[PDB]
Amino acid sequence: YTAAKYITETYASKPNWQAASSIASRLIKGEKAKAELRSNNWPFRVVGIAHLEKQEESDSIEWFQSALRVDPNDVESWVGLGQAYHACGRIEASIKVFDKAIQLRPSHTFAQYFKAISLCDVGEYLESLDILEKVCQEAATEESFQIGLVEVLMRCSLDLYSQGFLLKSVSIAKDTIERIKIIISELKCENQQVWIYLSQVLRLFIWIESKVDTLPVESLVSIFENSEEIDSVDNIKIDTLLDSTTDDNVSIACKFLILASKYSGTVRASYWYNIGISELTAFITLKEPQYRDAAIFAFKKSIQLQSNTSETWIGLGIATMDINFRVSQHCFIKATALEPKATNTWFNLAMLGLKKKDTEFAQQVLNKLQSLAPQDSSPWLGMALILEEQGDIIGSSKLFAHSFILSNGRSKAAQFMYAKNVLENHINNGDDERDIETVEKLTTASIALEQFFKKSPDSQFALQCALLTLERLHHYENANELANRLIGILEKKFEKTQDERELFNFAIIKGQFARIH
Amino acid sequence: MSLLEQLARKRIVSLSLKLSALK
Amino acid sequence: RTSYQFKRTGLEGKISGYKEEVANASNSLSITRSINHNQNSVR
Amino acid sequence: SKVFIATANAGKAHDADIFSVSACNSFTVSCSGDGYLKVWDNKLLDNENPKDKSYSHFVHKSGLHHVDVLQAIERDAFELCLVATTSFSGDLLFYRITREDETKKVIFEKLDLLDSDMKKHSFWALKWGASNDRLLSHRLVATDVKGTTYIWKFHPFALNWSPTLELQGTVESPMTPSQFATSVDISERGLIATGFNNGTVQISELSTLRPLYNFESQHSMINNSNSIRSVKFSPQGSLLAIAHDSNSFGCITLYETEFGERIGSLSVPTHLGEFAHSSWVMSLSFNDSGETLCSAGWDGKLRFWDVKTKERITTLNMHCDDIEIEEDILAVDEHGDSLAEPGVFDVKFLKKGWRSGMGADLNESLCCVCLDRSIRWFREAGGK
Known about the structure:
- The PDB classes it as hydrolase.
- The entry lists the keywords Helicase, RNA binding, RNA degradation, hydrolase.
- The entry is titled "CryoEM structure of a S. Cerevisiae Ski2387 complex in the closed state bound to RNA".
- The structure is cut from a larger assembly and holds chains A (about 525 residues), B (about 25 residues), C (about 45 residues) and D (about 375 residues).
- Chain C has strands spanning about 5-10, 15-20.
- In chain C, a hairpin with a 4-residue loop joins strand 1 and strand 2.
- A two-stranded antiparallel ribbon of chain C has the order 1-2.
- Chain C is built from no helices and 2 strands.
- Chain D is about 0% helix and about 50% strand.
- In chain D, strands 1-28-27-26 form a 4-stranded antiparallel beta sheet, with no helix packed on it.
- Chain D is globular.
- Chains A and C meet through helix 1, helix 3, helix 5, helix 7 and helix 9 of A and strand 1 and strand 2 of C.
């Protein structure tokens, strides 16, 4: 025992845990240390810890539980048991264990950080944020605590975005960007995780475009000023960014999005895939060929790195939708073969088939997708579009309504098509204002358009539809602002090309604006 | 005054500015 | 694909240092898949 | 909150409509249109009629329609309990509730806290703001028929008993001309919300008394319906529930108070559209954890909603035959009209341990007043 303890503590401080585990196991199994082992729990603790750095987490649970039964006051045994429970998908048990360990030793620091991570995993952002803020206040030198705080901030912002809290998501994104700027400026610590977090945060400003002017362009400059194959295509550089003119807010947002991907073979494949995804987002948002070329180049390199992931094939198929349909078809087939449980590839193939005006193939694939994922709102949208193209009107309306109900506000296209269909079905139908169903449909369409304008404003067709709906709903105060924005957009559009065909819509907009007054 | 309005009568950003100022 | 790992030191293992080392409900059958808080955790 | 079991009730408790109800740790307070104020002891024993442990006091001949009670331990041993009511004539009255040493009977003492110039107004709604670490002094907020919101500070001592109300300021209506302020609430974080008869809610800061938000909950402005009946803050979260009319329907809308954006609405299929109740929603109430919301409907039902998922949980039906003592059952009103499904005027959640009796010791309770002139108590099954 005494000699065994000496050897164990000598090997534990090397550190070298395999030998310590072997010695503890041969001491326990010897059955000659009966009386001594009922007062101390160091051998079981060493065995559990050694299993813990071996990443065989489930094997150390029993050892930590035995060591805790022997001594219920071991804080490190509780911490090890909780960190083992977390890796086994036992998050609530780990939360309770971390609470117990904190209760024994309130000054313990890593326990609070682990508890905050677990609370974030189960979806308790307020308590975890408070814990991590207090921990970072107590000791700001630790890099892991700051990275964890940024991680929790980003996850909370994304969860709020998915839940429909679009106004606090941008505020939490700004807080995350400020924290990242603080980290890079003061700690001078760089890692791939923080740049991935920044890129995830930057998508919130592009997605919520009505709040894009709030982007902290001052902190981002210092973030990109305190740290070549693809540079010749996109030509996106910090110097070119600074010395630029006649550039819109959204374009600057997308160019900022494509700098964290370039400032960070599995790791290299992920790096190039991230750059390609950012460039694909920029190409979809701005519609310029050089972004498409850069995205294809990055996707090709990432495929040449691993070629065993579905997402790279989906991205390659998306980036080559118009240049060639056979290439997109092959990419989508390969992606589906790689991961058969993903329902997005079938929808992408359906959209590709619809873009080539092949209705039967799209109908067949959408029937299969509906059999596969009935709860998603995209197959219903595709079927509604197909039936609208064919000529059926009642079924198209029913499918649009079902898609809108299933979307639960998470789809812009569902809202737009539902509003357009409702307006089309009730524009010259000869109905009165005493019908509850029609007024409720108009109210739902107005609410859907209000939600739509928060993500993609300055859309002429949606603005006109909303103006008509608000005129029907007697909401003359919102229609004034909407018509002012529409008039401004039309004036800006017609003051650049210097055309004259826009005078026809100008008169109609002026007449509607006069009706609103 | 607007160019389109003038033509009709005859026939009858933030992020960039802040970026330049900061630099 | 990168994460954090904790390496305790000495007897009565306490966290000493960290190193930078190299799936949803509808995709994986693993117990370690991500938990979605929108759905019921009981039914 | 899934299973609710009735524990006690008292039919024909008042002589007229019971318009509001409030509770404290020691008792439950009811106000009626007959001008009385009844105090019901919360610590009942087994086999005890609720009306046996009840005390009543006459306030105003014109009747009362709002009531709120404030109970706190102001010093090491001093305890004060205050009841504030407003009448149909528009008077604001304050009463101090104390108990005898031997008989343990409740004594009513009238207080004079408003000055002569303050007595010229007609108040409608009121709400006690207790100390919740936001500021050391209790708060009282009220609205008038002109649309103005008033804020006071209550000072019990000047231990010497000498109550005094100090006016902080007023907040005016956001629109010209002014409208009727129908409801008011105050949160623990220091926020004030006011509802108006046109469907507009205004939020102002407690410290500086300036407006923050002005959001409009009207489905459509074709007609002049859709007034606001109840506004309630979440006990811990940044959430505000609005109960508003929709041309003979009842609607509930949820907002978040950090930025003032619309979150969603609660609705169920009823004999289409987005409506929460068949007739109207008259009251709202949050539980202690702020995860369940209870809406009292004019149709005669209590509906419980899940805040996060915005889905209904369970429904409680009210009948005139639920009264234990059959001699207290009021089947028909003074005009012979049926009361088999009487509408609910007010609903209140009681904290754990407030109401004791038949198994209600370790779980949350609930109280409601209905159109049959009855007061009813429920308890949540299980424990916590």
